[PDB]
Amino acid sequence: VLVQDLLHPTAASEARKHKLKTLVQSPRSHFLDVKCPGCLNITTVFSHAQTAVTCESCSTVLCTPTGGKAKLSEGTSFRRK
Amino acid sequence: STELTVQSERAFQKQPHIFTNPKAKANRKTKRWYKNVGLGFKTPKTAIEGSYIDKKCPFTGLVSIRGKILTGTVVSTRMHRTIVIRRDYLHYVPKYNRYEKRHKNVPAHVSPAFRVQVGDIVTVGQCRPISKTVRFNVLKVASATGKANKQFAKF
Amino acid sequence: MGRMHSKGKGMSSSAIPYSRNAPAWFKGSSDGVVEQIIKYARKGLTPSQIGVLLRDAHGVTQAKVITGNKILRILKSNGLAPEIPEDLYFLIKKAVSVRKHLERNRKDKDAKFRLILIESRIHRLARYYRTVSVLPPNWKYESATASALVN
Amino acid sequence: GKGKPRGLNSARKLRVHRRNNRWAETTYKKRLLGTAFKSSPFGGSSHAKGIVLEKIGIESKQPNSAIRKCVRVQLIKNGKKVTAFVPNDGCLNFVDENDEVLLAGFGRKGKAKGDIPGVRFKVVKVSGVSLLALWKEKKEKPRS
Amino acid sequence: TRTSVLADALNAINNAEKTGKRQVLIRPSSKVIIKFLQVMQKHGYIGEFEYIDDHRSGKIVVQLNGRLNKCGVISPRFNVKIADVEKWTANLLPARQFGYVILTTSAGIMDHEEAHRKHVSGKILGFVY
Amino acid sequence: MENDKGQLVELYVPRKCSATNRIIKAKDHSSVQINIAQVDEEGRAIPGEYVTYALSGYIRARGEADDSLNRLAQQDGLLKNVWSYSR
Amino acid sequence: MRAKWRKKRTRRLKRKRRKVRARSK
RNA sequence: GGAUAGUGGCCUACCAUGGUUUCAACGGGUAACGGGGAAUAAGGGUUCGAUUCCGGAGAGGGAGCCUGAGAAACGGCUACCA
RNA sequence: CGGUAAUUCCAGCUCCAGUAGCGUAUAUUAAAGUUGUUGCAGUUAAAAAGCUCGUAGUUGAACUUUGGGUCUGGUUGUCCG
RNA sequence: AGGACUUUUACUUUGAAAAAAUUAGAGUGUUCAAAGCAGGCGAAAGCUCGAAUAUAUUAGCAUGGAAUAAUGGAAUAGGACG
RNA sequence: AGGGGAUCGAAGAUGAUCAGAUACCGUCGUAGUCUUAACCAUAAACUAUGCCGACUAGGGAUCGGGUGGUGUUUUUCUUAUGACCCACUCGGCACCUUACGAGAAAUCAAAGUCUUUGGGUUCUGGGGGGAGUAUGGUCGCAAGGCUGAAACUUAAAGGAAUUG
Ligand SMILES: [Mg+2]
Ligand SMILES: [Mg+2]
Ligand SMILES: [Mg+2]
Ligand SMILES: [Mg+2]
Ligand SMILES: [Mg+2]
Ligand SMILES: [Mg+2]
Ligand SMILES: [Mg+2]
Ligand SMILES: [Mg+2]
Ligand SMILES: [Mg+2]
Ligand SMILES: [Mg+2]
Ligand SMILES: [Mg+2]
Ligand SMILES: [Mg+2]
Ligand SMILES: [Mg+2]
Ligand SMILES: [Mg+2]
Ligand SMILES: [Mg+2]
Ligand SMILES: [Mg+2]
Ligand SMILES: [Mg+2]
Ligand SMILES: [Mg+2]
Ligand SMILES: [Mg+2]
Ligand SMILES: [Mg+2]
Ligand SMILES: [Mg+2]
Ligand SMILES: [Mg+2]
Ligand SMILES: [Mg+2]
Ligand SMILES: [Mg+2]
Ligand SMILES: [Mg+2]
Ligand SMILES: [Mg+2]
Ligand SMILES: [Mg+2]
Ligand SMILES: [Mg+2]
Ligand SMILES: [Mg+2]
Ligand SMILES: [Mg+2]
Ligand SMILES: [Mg+2]
Ligand SMILES: [Mg+2]
Ligand SMILES: [Mg+2]
Ligand SMILES: [Zn+2]
């Protein structure tokens, strides 16, 4: 503790700490490419989305607002961006 | 705050001892006398071709500018033919090594050649005692507006 | 963690990513993003809702990253910036709502204090928007002006 | 960090704060109010003459049992009346009734000294001559 | 609110020195902090520090070696005339043989001895020894 | 410390903590001085030849004595990877 | 003595003095 | 415009309604003449400065004035009050 | 201190301090870090307004050329003439 | 040495200024000193060095510097140049 | 002032206890307690600790939110929730240990980073008593609130802790 690296702390400790508290502050969020069983369009959505995101082709919601991050619509298949 | 008539009061308003000959047929506007106060101060063209009289004009009147030159900010332009300038400064209390914001109100006499309004920073110059309290004649309106040069927003 | 008008000490916020430039995976066009912003504004949406719509339904991380200008700046360039800034307008709406609740029931003193707090915040924000000259120098806040601006 | 302001342009409030706090002292308040000139038996005076009215002794406090031999004197400069103390073994008899006596301070900043209650003034001279010269028989009372 | 950032930096340095550490993480990392730590490096009271760009005020990581004993800002940056430098050194530094009143002159942020060498003086920043 | 001619006038130029570089007080009755014996090729502790580390009483009281000794021994090639410079 | 009852005695003195002044005001 | 040696609400005539102020104006107190300075002394300061020098004011309190270049003089006059 | 053995009162002896000066009174300064800008304290010793908003006042995040190479002038300590 | 434009400060270095007496302080056997601005040296035949300096920390004037602290540019381009 | 009017209970009525007892114990008992308007602005209104900001030390829990678990029961066949379990984080009322820091100590994780004295800022105190009294304002219908001395007197008053 008396001698310790702050310029290069362990990446495990990086994921340990809070956002806004890293060496350089970086968001923990990410984007997703979701496909709805309806059509073949790939929709880009946010992990912590705040709106009932729907595909422009069909009036089917793909996410759902939540106190934290998005909860999907039980049938959409996603890939992390 | 300036009357449309070039003379409005009961007495006639003329520049003393400058005479325009009516028998002559040159028929120029008048014979207007003027001077430059020096110190590299530009006489305003509104005074150069103007039609006011202002006995106490540094540029057209008999008053001469000499002595102190003070820069201040206008705090009251809304009494006739005269201005009230707020001069701010810092008095140094040495027992604490600390400064103290202070202000003084300097009356002055702004010529009609200048268009002044509340908030304009003004360079003013010393002269003879003009009234009981005014001893300075406005010599330059440095900041005409300051932050009102651009007003509208039409892209 | 200041909470200007209360005793809160929270720091819940968002950390802007280090890289200012566009994300590698984004394929959209900046001109198309500007057109989308313009259309959303013409629908009658404030810049914050425009940003939230671009972040959720599309891959726009943030307008300044993609276009180079901010959302309100983009709207102003096209002349769609509202005459009252969005935060001040929302404060006006909240104040008029609490005043309505007050005039419909007098005995509630807590909402009276909250209205005092909201009015103080409105005064501070109005002063700021007045020294920057976004609002005219004669702009002020009294009763029945908030309703006129909101309605 | 501290109650007082520290900014470079905070001289005004520091000065007025010191000026308002100075009244908490007793010496400063006395000096500025001028209480000595108005209320004290002498106004800024180290000594003062007076006329003996009567010849009284006052008992001492609890731990000290005696009767200190004082004298009531009406001041001539303004007319106030104060008790004063004649300091020595056999000096009471030296001062007689209705003679001019020069009173001085009692040394305790205008407050009662020791065990003597309600007195604040010594006696230095009587009828023009000093007590100390009489007590050692160096001079004698003129008896006028 | 954070009024004097250099005060926070020097307080963090003092706290992380008294506890016996060898490093500090100063968050706001202005020009003045960089110049102050650079002077301390020049005079040896500090080790090998580091600026970490965040695109937002950056940060600084400071390496110590236990040689320092106290930093400290004179929070009101008093206008120090060239005659008053000696009085400040007497009132702040523990001995005439060492210590340095870091003050900001028009010729940059410099230790008091260097400023006296240039025969120039300005406002006072802090003191190190 | 130094006389103008150039002779020392100080007495007992004091030791310093080997982990925090702070001097050791004369009456610092918490500080210790560890000796670690040098080891030859066949594991025989060579007598009278060792390496000394002066740990201050402050770090011992705080609780960083063993960690500091771990780091200090790792630096001078005594223990293999017992201490990581990045926590 | 308690500060409470000294306060109350002062208040009763003010009682009497206020009634007297009101009579002679 | 008058008066001034001369600028100046200094005074008059007619207009305008203005000027100062929480950066303490105005009022009250000063057993206050201002200053150069004195005592005190780690540094910062606290108190004093009627008086040997420079300024100001006064000749019992008030007003008025002749003479002159210079006085509202008072070891110059006029009047009132004491 | 003085209540029948007074190292304190009145005296004699001896001694001490300053010394042609010393003692008193008031005022004032240092002592006073008991005015605290340097430099005071506020839990209980005196002292955090019952709490919040708020004009003036005081204070207020970071950022806008930092580096280098040469020549050259004084000043030093250089080695010695 | 002339037209021309001057972002403005706060800050700080240097200088001119801040009357003499006083404070500091150089020289000087008033018999020493407080002091004073004196005196010293010839062969005794007139020859002489002096009467030094600094500080005042505010206001004003000039000057070099550009860190620290503040204000102002170009957003309707009514922006800068040819 | 208008409404109510159960309980409990200033005043009062008594019955006891006592030397006295119009006090404590007891029984009744108006005003009040409960409310709609209008006043009042004081409390040991206390954490007797001003607010904002930074840093400094270890141990668990607890509340609100959010992340992850190849976790466990749940049952609606599986899953989605929910409820727990483990780990982390933000914010809050808090708590245990300790001095390596601070205090006159009791003690404080702030009452620390203060003679190695300066992050910004507001209010208050200069021995005790007189005294939060008088007077003068100002607010209040009234009660009283805010502001608020001196004369004089006194060598102490007071804080924490140690032994009796
Ligand atoms: Mg008796
Ligand atoms: Mg007088
Ligand atoms: Mg005088
Ligand atoms: Mg005086
Ligand atoms: Mg007098
Ligand atoms: Mg004189
Ligand atoms: Mg005269
Ligand atoms: Mg007389
Ligand atoms: Mg003559
Ligand atoms: Mg006369
Ligand atoms: Mg005479
Ligand atoms: Mg005369
Ligand atoms: Mg005569
Ligand atoms: Mg005897
Ligand atoms: Mg104290
Ligand atoms: Mg108590
Ligand atoms: Mg208390
Ligand atoms: Mg409080
Ligand atoms: Mg304000
Ligand atoms: Mg800044
Ligand atoms: Mg002089
Ligand atoms: Mg002398
Ligand atoms: Mg009723
Ligand atoms: Mg009863
Ligand atoms: Mg009974
Ligand atoms: Mg009962
Ligand atoms: Mg009952
Ligand atoms: Mg109270
Ligand atoms: Mg309280
Ligand atoms: Mg007291
Ligand atoms: Mg009391
Ligand atoms: Mg009253
Ligand atoms: Mg006790
Ligand atoms: Zn579809």
Where along chain A do its domains lie?
1-81
Pair of tokens at residue D12 = 């005004």
Whether residue C73 sits in one domain with residue C43 = yes
User: How far is the CA of C9 from the CAs of A26, C4, C5, in angstroms?
Assistant: 22, 10, 11
Q: How far is B85 from chain D (nearest CA, A)?
A: 23
- The two tokens of residue E8 are 């926070």
Please count the CA atoms within 13 angstroms of the CA of B27 that sit on its side-chain side: 1
Longest dimension (CA), chain B: 74
Q: Which residues pair with B138 in a beta bridge?
A: B124
CA distance B136 to E4: 42
What CATH homologous superfamily does A1-81 map to?
Ribosomal protein S27 (2.20.25.100)
Asked whether residue C6 is domain-assigned, the answer is no
Q: Which domain holds residue D138?
A: 1-144
Q: Domain E69-129 is in which class?
A: alpha beta
Distance, in Å, from the CA atom of D10 to the CA atom of C139, rounded to the nearest integer, reads 33
What is the third-level CATH fold of B1-155?
OB fold (Dihydrolipoamide Acetyltransferase, E2P) (2.40.50)
How many structural domains is chain F composed of? 1
DSSP notation for C14-72: ----S--S--TT----HHHHHHHHHHHHHTT--HHHHHHHHHHTSS-S-HHHHTSS-HH
The DSSP secondary structure of E30-75, one letter per residue, reads -HHHHHHHHHHHHHTSS---EEE--SSS-EEEEE--S------B-S
Residue C94 sits in the same domain as residue C141: yes
C-alpha C53/C-alpha D68 separation (Å) is 100
Write out the residue range of the structural domain in which residue C102 sits. Answer: 82-151
**Long-range contacts of the stretch A13-19 (C-beta < 8 A, 24+):** A13/F87, A19/C15
d(CA A4, CA F78): 19
- CATH code of residue F10: 3.30.1230.20
Experimental method: cryo-EM
Which of D78, D79, D130 is closest to D104 using CA atoms?
A: D130
State how many domains chain D has.
1
CA-nearest of C102, C106, C97, C146 to C122 is C146
> Is the CB of residue B7 less than 8 Å from the CB of residue B53?
yes
| C65: in domain | yes
C75 neighbourhood in chain B, CB within 8 Å:
none
- Closest nucleotide C1' to the C-alpha of B97: I37
Say how far D124 CA is from I29 C1', in Å: 27
Reduced 3-state DSSP string for F15-47: CECCCCCCECCCCCCCCEEEEEEEECCCCCEEE
Within this chain, do residues C149 and C97 fall inside the same structural domain, yes or no?
Answer: yes
Domain ranges for chain B? 1-155
The domain defined by E1-68 carries CATH number 3.40.190.10: no
| Number of CB atoms found within 10 A of residue C68's CB | 14
- Supply angle C-alpha C86, C87, C89, rounded to 5: 65
Beta-carbon count within 10 A of B57 CB: 23
3-state DSSP call for residue B154? coil
Using the 3D structure, point to which of C48, C65, C81 is the last residue of a domain: C81
Mark whether C110 and C73 lie in a shared domain. Answer: no
Residue that finishes a domain, picked among C81, C97, C113? C81
Of C42, C59, C81, the domain-final residue:
C81
Interface probe, candidates C18, C19, C64, chain E, greatest E C-beta count within 10 A: C18
Q: What is the DSSP string of B49-68?
A: S-----TT-TTTSS----S-
Q: Which helix (H) or strand (E) holds E22?
A: none
Instruction: Please report, to the nearest 10 degrees, the dihedral formed by the alpha carbons of residues D7, D12, D18, D21 taken in order.
Output: -110
- The residues of D between 109 and 138 with beta carbon within 7 Å of nucleic strand I are 109-110, 115, 122, 124
